[model samples]
Target: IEVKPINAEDTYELRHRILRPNQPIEACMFESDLLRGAFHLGGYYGGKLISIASFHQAEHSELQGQKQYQLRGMATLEGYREQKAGSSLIKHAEEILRKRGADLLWCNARTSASGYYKKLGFSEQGEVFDTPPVGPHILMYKRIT
Candidate 1:
């Protein structure tokens, strides 16, 4: 699969399917999606969108003194998991953020997804927490520099 930047709408279906199956499609969108410095990236295999991730210029409340980018709405289609699509999307985000002078990347990773984030070199920095309808999550981050 190939990973690259894509329009925000390109992320909706996959984000909805994998991250929010019960919520409305609108719930899958982030307010920063159309902001100047925000961007969405996706992985396509055989012309099918299989994975997606969005990055925005936001700081982690717990990570002090750094230019941080927050990762949001990251998901790979169910059948496409563990095939490196998610990893590729994250690496792409890291490269983009690093080039733009970001010092770190962070995400409120779902507890079920913590292992995947860990495999990509992110560290857990805070206590586990719940985000309701989406269940529990933990603060995961990595230095981009």
Candidate 2:
């Protein structure tokens, strides 16, 4: 598998299939997807896109005094887990983020994926936030050097 840059318009199908299946494709849309410095990426297996994640410049009040990037819409196909595709995609972004001088890389991880983020070296923070449609999420972050 390989990680590479992808277009915002190219992420919807997987976003819909894996992240927001019960909702319309439009539900996968995020304003941040089009934010000026935002970018999207995906993992390709034998040239087929199977996993996706997006990053955007954000200011989270609790993380004041640092240049931050938030990870959003990260999802992988059922057969794609444990192969490091997701992790590799993220690591690639961190190198880019580091070059661009990002201080931290963070994500609002759904409950089940919380441990996985921990395995990738992100520290969990704050209380659980409950959101409709998706339910509970944990805020997690890793500093970029």
Candidate 3:
């Protein structure tokens, strides 16, 4: 898989699939906007866009002022899942951020996906909290070397 920057409009198919299951595809427009100021990374396998991921500089001070990158919008095709596509994209993002001088990386991972992020070297932060009527989320972070 090749990882590269993707515009929000082109990212909707996978972005919406990962982040906004309850909302329509049109919601990806806002999602796309969220990605505009950040680094929107994606993966393509076999000439098809199969995965999406994003990162941006830390905004909140609640995170101990760590130089962090926020992970966002990761998804993969059903048939392509469990095949390392997600991991591949994540690894690529980490490498990119690390090269860019990031000291920490974090994500608001879905409850169901905590295990996945854990395996990627992230540890859960505070308590688990509902993402309000959508689902539960936990802040997870990794101190990069």
Candidate 4:
């Protein structure tokens, strides 16, 4: 498996498969790009694109005084799902952001995924909600020191 940065457009298909397997591909792709802002990450396995995730900062956005980074678009192919692909992808991004002096890392984790994030030291910050009618989600955060 190889890890690399990729353009947001190239991640659409695999992302849809992982995030919304039963939904319309176009809709998932549209929302993935729409909400990802301008930064992103993707993972490849044995020369094929597989997992994808995004990193976002509050810089130059409507929210000020909040220097927070986000991890979104986290997805993995079926065969790669339990093989550390997601963890490696996230660790790669965390290293880059940590080197850049980022203070916070957060994501609206699907409730089903909350335990996984907690295992990585992320804690829930607020209430949970069902997003896009697909499943429950919770706001989670981890501080980088």
- Compared with the true structure, what per-residue lDDT tens digits does model 3 show for residues 1-145? 7877787677777767767778877766644356434777777888888888777776445675446788777778776677677888788877888887878888888989999888888899888998764589999888776
Off by over 4 Å in 3: 30-37
Cα-based lDDT at residue 100, candidate 1:
92
RMSD of each: 1.1, 1.0, 2.3, 3.3
- 19-133 in candidate 4: lDDT tens per residue? 8778777765544355534467777788888888788765424222356787777778888777778888888888888887777788889988888788788888768888885
**Could you say which candidate leads in TM-score?**
2
TM, every model: 0.95, 0.96, 0.85, 0.82
How would you encode candidate 2's per-residue C-alpha lDDT over 16-119 as one tens digit per residue?
A: 99888999888989888988799989999976898898999996888643789999999888888789888988989898899988999989899889988988
TM-score of 2: 0.96
- Write down the TM-score for model 1: 0.95
Model 3 global lDDT (CA atoms, 0 to 1): 0.76
Which of candidates 1 and 2 reaches a greater TM-score?
Answer: 2
For model 2, the stretches where C-alpha displacement exceeds 4 angstroms are: none
* Model 4 TM-score relative to the real fold: 0.82
Clashing pairs in 4: none
Superposition-based RMSD of candidate 4 using all C-alpha atoms, in angstroms: 3.3
